[PDB]
Design a protein around this ligand. Structure first.
Ligand SMILES: *[C@@H]1O[C@H](CO[C@@H]2O[C@@H](C)[C@@H](O)[C@@H](O)[C@@H]2O)[C@@H](O[C@@H]2O[C@H](CO)[C@@H](O[C@@H]3O[C@H](CO)[C@@H](O)[C@H](O)[C@@H]3O)[C@H](O)[C@H]2NC(C)=O)[C@H](O)[C@H]1NC(C)=O
Ligand SMILES: *[C@@H]1O[C@H](CO[C@@H]2O[C@@H](C)[C@@H](O)[C@@H](O)[C@@H]2O)[C@@H](O[C@@H]2O[C@H](CO)[C@@H](O[C@@H]3O[C@H](CO)[C@@H](O)[C@H](O)[C@@H]3O)[C@H](O)[C@H]2NC(C)=O)[C@H](O)[C@H]1NC(C)=O
Ligand SMILES: *[C@@H]1O[C@H](CO[C@@H]2O[C@@H](C)[C@@H](O)[C@@H](O)[C@@H]2O)[C@@H](O[C@@H]2O[C@H](CO)[C@@H](O[C@@H]3O[C@H](CO)[C@@H](O)[C@H](O)[C@@H]3O)[C@H](O)[C@H]2NC(C)=O)[C@H](O)[C@H]1NC(C)=O
Ligand SMILES: *[C@@H]1O[C@H](CO[C@@H]2O[C@@H](C)[C@@H](O)[C@@H](O)[C@@H]2O)[C@@H](O[C@@H]2O[C@H](CO)[C@@H](O[C@@H]3O[C@H](CO)[C@@H](O)[C@H](O)[C@@H]3O)[C@H](O)[C@H]2NC(C)=O)[C@H](O)[C@H]1NC(C)=O
Lengths: 220, 220
């Protein structure tokens, strides 16, 4: 894990979206570059670049349709020190640790490693459930952050001191998860009409999203 | 530590002598080779080979005077899969773990690692010390394996049950060690003329070397 190879430790990309993973051999340019290879941790080579032999993306799983080098030079940069790797149509399966390796000469190989995270932005909905008075604590409201990656975090902003209950469950999409949160309390008459807000946090949002809902109690 | 790179785990060479360290990328030949580099563990590159840029031995310590590739081809083998590295004028300082690395394309780098040991063959001498009768246990014989690497192992084959004492000490040559072994016993009259043998074992010898000596006691 060499300082003269510059990369970013972490990099995030939207499910089914695109990311560039940057990688550079930092100058001074005091060594020739022999070839560049992007490997996964398993060892599996993802993309490879060679000044004579050209480019290759030998894994059927990370094919040329999705992977590409950003390198822009007109077929002939006096040296290929920028090794930046673009992904498209991101898969959950691409979440991984990628390793950018420069075979230099006569200096040996230098590498840098970047963690690619695939985020999925969930879909959010809340509602009140209409309830009758009674001593049993029932769900008076629910909030659901569907198909998040990673799992979203729901909390309840309410003036009444009702217990929250939540649970996980698999998302529709491979490696997404839906979070279900139920707001329960003993239904009391003064509660009718009171706004109770669902507060859902997730990587993909600038900040917590708020889904306000108004409670509904029997016999106003 | 890849199976498709063939090397030898261990390799021994005489101080101030020569060794070849062999290294091959095993066929089938299903990948192009980009460049070959021999690194020490520290990382320090010892020798490097590149099909276009040529050869280099960039470390002042392992210079071209001593290092060389055995590779024989007339400047143009269709591929340079044999990466065998010759050393000469071996130094104690070269004892190390060397790593043979093939930058392949598009396949990544494969490597193999060989431990290079520098042996020094010691010089051996033994003698009896002449002694007078007396209750005090004195050295009646000594044996010295001078300037060994690694340290030699001396033992005594004798019919009399005398205690052995030995000690280390630095050798003349950097990273050699002299072993001194004294054969002591209470000098008894029947012992005169009795052969007592020095038995010294060391890597460099086919087997244990034997230095026989005849005891010398006062008043036969
Ligand atoms: C470098 O990678 C190449 C190609 O790798 C192939 O595809 C990638 C997406 C990955 O899935 C790789 O795992 C995959 O191999 C390798 O070439 C292949 O080498 C192997 C031998 O190591 C060949 O298998 C042999 O097949 C023959 C008969 O066809 C048998 O007789 C052998 O016993 C053996 O099973 C394979 O056919 C070959 N592929 C091609 C297109 O030639 C290469 O081995 C690898 N090299 C290194 C050093 O990693
Ligand atoms: C991708 O790689 C990153 C970072 O690199 C990590 O370090 C490397 C040098 C290797 O040794 C890798 O094995 C290692 O993953 C990973 O981030 C790290 O993930 C590990 C899980 O394997 C986390 O370890 C935890 O550490 C805490 C203490 O803080 C313990 O309580 C746990 O038991 C657990 O061991 C670690 O927190 C995390 N580090 C950072 C900075 O996020 C990553 O997991 C791996 N993932 C992917 C998707 O590629
Ligand atoms: C690959 O190795 C080359 C040459 O390495 C040199 O000799 C070997 C036997 C080893 O002892 C190496 O450690 C040694 O560097 C490296 O080239 C050298 O790069 C450094 C910068 O990393 C240069 O030092 C700079 O010097 C200038 C002024 O001269 C300062 O302004 C800088 O602040 C810095 O100190 C050094 O001069 C340069 N040598 C040559 C001949 O150009 C190279 O860095 C290295 N590359 C990698 C990726 O490892
Ligand atoms: C050169 O390298 C060899 C072999 O490779 C070794 O394994 C590598 C994968 C790395 O992890 C290296 O760190 C490691 O050296 C070395 O041979 C081994 O040396 C180590 C000392 O570092 C020995 O370890 C001992 O193990 C015993 C238990 O059996 C313990 O009681 C000791 O505490 C000690 O840790 C090990 O015996 C030895 N292995 C063999 C097969 O000989 C070598 O030391 C290193 N030396 C040189 C000159 O390059």
């Amino acid at each position: 894990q060499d300082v003269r190879v510059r990369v970013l430790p972490e990099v995030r990309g939207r499910l089914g979206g695109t990311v560039e993973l940057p990688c550079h051999l930092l100058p001074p340019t005091t060594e020739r570059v022999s070839q560049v290879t992007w490997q996964r941790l398993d060892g599996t080579v993802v993309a490879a670049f060679h000044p004579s032999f050209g480019v290759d993306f030998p894994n059927s799983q990370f094919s040329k349709d999705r992977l590409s080098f950003v390198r822009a030079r007109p077929e002939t940069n006096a040296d290929l020190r920028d090794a930046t790797l673009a992904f498209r149509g991101l898969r959950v399966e691409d979440e991984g640790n990628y390793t950018c390796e420069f075979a230099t000469f006569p200096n040996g190989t230098r590498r840098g490693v970047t963690w690619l995270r695939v985020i999925a932005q969930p879909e959010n909905h809340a509602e009140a459930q209409e309830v009758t008075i009674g001593p049993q604590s029932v769900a008076v409201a629910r909030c659901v952050s569907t198909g998040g990656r990673p799992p979203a975090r729901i909390t309840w902003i309410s003036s009444l001191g009702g217990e929250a209950k939540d649970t996980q469950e698999p998302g529709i999409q491979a490696g997404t998860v839906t979070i279900i949160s139920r707001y329960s309390l003993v239904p009391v008459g003064r509660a009718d009409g009171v706004k109770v807000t669902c507060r859902v946090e997730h990587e993909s949002f600038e900040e917590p999203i708020l889904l306000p809902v108004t409670l509904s109690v029997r016999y106003h």
